[PDB]
Amino acid sequence: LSRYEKWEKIKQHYQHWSDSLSEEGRGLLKKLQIPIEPKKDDIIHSLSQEEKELLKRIQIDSSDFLSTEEKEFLKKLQIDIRDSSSNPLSEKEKEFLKKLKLDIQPYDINQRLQDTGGLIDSPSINLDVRKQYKRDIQNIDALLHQSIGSTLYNKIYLYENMNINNLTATLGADLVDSTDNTKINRGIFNEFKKNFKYSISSNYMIVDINERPALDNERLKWRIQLSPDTRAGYLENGKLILQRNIGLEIKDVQIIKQSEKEYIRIDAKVVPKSKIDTKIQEAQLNINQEWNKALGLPKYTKLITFNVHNRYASNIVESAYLILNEWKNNIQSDLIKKVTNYLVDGNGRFVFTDITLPNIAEQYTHQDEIYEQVHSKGLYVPESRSILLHGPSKGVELRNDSEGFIHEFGHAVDDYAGYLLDKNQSDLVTNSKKFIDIFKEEGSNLTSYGRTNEAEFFAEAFRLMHSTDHAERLKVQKNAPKTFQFINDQIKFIINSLV
Ligand SMILES: Cc1cc(S(=O)(=O)N(Cc2ccc([N+](=O)[O-])cc2)[C@H](C)C(=O)NO)ccc1F
Ligand SMILES: [Zn+2]
Q: Angle 109-116/23-33 helices, nearest 10 degrees?
């Protein structure tokens, strides 16, 4: 092989292609590798001084609609204004921040592709910028026309280092052994691997020709074999950019040692994306048939959607089975059937996805304003009667995804309770005067996040009331007894409704 010969051999295979790039095609490939960050300068100059002042004083971490990267850029903003315990955010703070959110995003082509799963017409960004992305993406596709071919494809491996958290933030938090960081927690490793059979790249993978030693937080070391018709381009310093929309079969996942630290080897083979989409679609059919039976729904009913497009694809699929099983185990059968039938009556969905929730139609078709769209671990959208669950991310103070689902189902229970109460004036039961008063009293007795408003308080209480941990079910009865009773009352009220 030889690392250096391999490199020169691949470079030569693409030499005509490289020499052919215009300065425009060249600038585009660099824009793809290096996103154009927002200039913190311009940002602050566009604010009024009352907003400069307002921004400085906000508890940024107490936002439920901002990601970590976003929260961090705003603290770096907060401080540069200034160089010249967890109370719920105010109304005028939230409105301000929701709009500021739209002005601090990088122009990041690979990120736009990952967040949308390639559905780049999703109205989750400004239409002018949306077309820019599309122009760049179409141009890059056209550049990437030369396949790796029949000679090189089975004679080379390509490599990618990855952060575990890019696939699953929930497992990533505890994949490195806590008492020794050079070691992989064997139990977590078995779970990460058990349902990792295929993977989709909806963006342009940038891969190394020769394996590169891990940097900070790169415990995943992919080794990838291309197919002869995989299209790619040479990039300087020993790299290849691969075409978007490819499928990978996971051939082997192993713990391995490199320089006295432990790493996860992921061996993968490029296959046609369509082959993997067929597996996904088949599993969607399967899980709907299983759960239409269990719920006494017509067999052709479409209730569960796999909206799946990214690198941990197969786990998002297997995970939905578990999530729904825990849901079934910890919630009364009749409550489940009554509420789910209500959601089916409104064409609702359980959406399990690895794209960001603003790019889910059950959210965006009812939320025209981007400053009102939300990304998070989970969501209930009453206008479309759907529960949305984002696989890859980790919910704030959430053990697992099963608990997150139960919380969202809590929002659905609120919806249906208030509907039954007044079917002509459909409102949320937590908007009722009785519950409002309960909230002003007990509202601070459960989780910190339960303080936000009536709806979340209800959903947290509901979730805690159905925990597998008996201690938690009891802390609600003890610390929030009117809420406890109010909810069990809603539950009886729903279960006793007609057919
Ligand atoms: C605990 C919990 C969280 C979530 S969440 O996805 O993280 N989540 C709430 C949340 C809570 C706390 C923070 N925060 O930045 O502190 C951010 C977001 C969303 C907004 C929600 O309530 N959807 O219904 C979902 C369910 C759930 F049970
Ligand atoms: Zn909620």
A: 60
Sign of CA dihedral 384, 385, 391, 394: positive
Percent helix, strand, coil in the chain, to 5, is 50, 15, 35
Rounded Cα distance, 29 and 25, in Å? 6
- Residue 186: partners with Cβ closer than 8 Å, 6 or more residues away: 255
Strand order in the sheet with 350-353: 304-307, 350-353, 386-390, 378-381
401-420 and 454-465 helices, crossing angle to 10°: 120
Complete domains list, the chain, with CATH = 1-37+106-272 (3.90.176.10), 38-105 (1.10.2030.10), 273-499 (3.40.390.10)
Experimental approach was X-ray
The edge-to-edge listing of strands for the beta sheet with 206-208 is 198-201, 246-258, 261-271, 220-225, 158-162, 206-208, 239-242, 232-235
Which residues have C-beta atoms less than 6 Å from ligand 1? 63-64, 376-380, 395-398, 404, 407-408, 411, 449, 456, 463
CA 490/CA 499 separation, integer angstroms: 18
d(Cα 357, Cα 376) in Å, to the nearest integer?
7
The number of C-alpha atoms within 13 Å of 31 and in the hemisphere containing its C-beta is 17
**What 3-state DSSP class applies to 314?**
helix
Q: State how far the Cα of 347 lies from the Cα of 92, in Å rounded to an integer.
A: 34
Which residue owns the Cα nearest ligand 1 atom 15?
64
Please tell me whether residue 385 adopts helix, strand or coil conformation.
coil
The annotation status of 16 as a binding-site residue, yes or no, is no
408 is known as an active-site residue: yes
H-type helices in 382-453, by residue range?
A: 401-420, 433-442
Element (H, E) at 53: helix 49-57
The first and second tokens of residue 481, run together, are: 């007894």
